[PDB]
Amino acid sequence: MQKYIVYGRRLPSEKFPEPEVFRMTIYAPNEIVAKSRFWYHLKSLKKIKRTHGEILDCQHIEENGDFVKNFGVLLRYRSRVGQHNMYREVRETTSARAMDKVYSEMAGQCRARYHDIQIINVKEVADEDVRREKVAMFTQKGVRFPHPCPYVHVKRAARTRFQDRAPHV
């Protein structure tokens, strides 16, 4: 939901005076979950527990949302059968908003919650590179389709309920 670049390292020691600083880009709802996800990875990836480590920064990045881009995300998710790898493309104005779409699609179709899914990388695919037909259908220059759901103006009927005529669509 938000997008954060979290910097953290292991605590300084006498055998290793300067420890390596590792930066990860974590998409998370809040700073505390971003820090939590960072440590989950740095425990498995580089054997650094939070107890044995210091987080030196959890910066929030406010990416410009003026124009739509195509995003391409690769993730690893866990089913009731076993872990699977997956590449999902999404067209959204920003990367933080693109992870919301991906997480929503993975919750609805893959029944996968945020804590199961690990995001290997997010990237901006160009219109030429898009590999999903849902994404590619709208990359085309002039895309015109009737309103997908025009009956959805039933938002009038709750406030109205009775009406003299049944409304046309």
Binding site: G65, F145, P150
Partner: protein, 128 residues
């Protein structure tokens, strides 16, 4: 007729900017769209196509036109005027006025609405 294409004037059915006029810029998916309303009050946002009912007028638009380029075209195009002078446009203006009515005003109108119901009975009886 009436399609989700760049430039279609869209009435905003719901959301923070309900009751407002915007132009579609790009279609993220059938579900969504990026609209902006420089002549009106809508800032640039991605809304669900559900919240935006299409209007007949489509404004000429340069692809991916920012706010400043979109404003120049939205101001120049006579589409917003044609819609606002239309039957839907006039209703939207009438609906806008109705919402800002105090309890004192609601009473004023209800007396003047009863007066009309009775006037039509007086007129319909006259039409023999």
């Amino acid at each position: 007729h009436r399609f989700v294409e760049a430039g279609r004037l869209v009435y905003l059915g719901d959301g923070p900017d309900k009751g407002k006029l915007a132009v579609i810029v790009d279609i993220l998916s059938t579900a969504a769209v990026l609209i902006d309303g420089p002549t009106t009050g809508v800032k640039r946002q991605v809304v669900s196509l559900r919240w935006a009912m299409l209007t007949d007028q489509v404004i000429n638009i340069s692809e991916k036109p920012t706010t400043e380029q979109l404003k120049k075209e939205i101001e120049a195009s006579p589409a917003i005027d044609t819609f606002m002078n239309s039957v839907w446009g006039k209703k939207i203006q009438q609906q806008r006025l109705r919402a800002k009515a105090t309890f004192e005003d609601m009473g004023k109108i209800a007396k003047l609405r009863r007066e009309r119901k009775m006037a039509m009975k007086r007129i319909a009886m006259s039409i023999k």
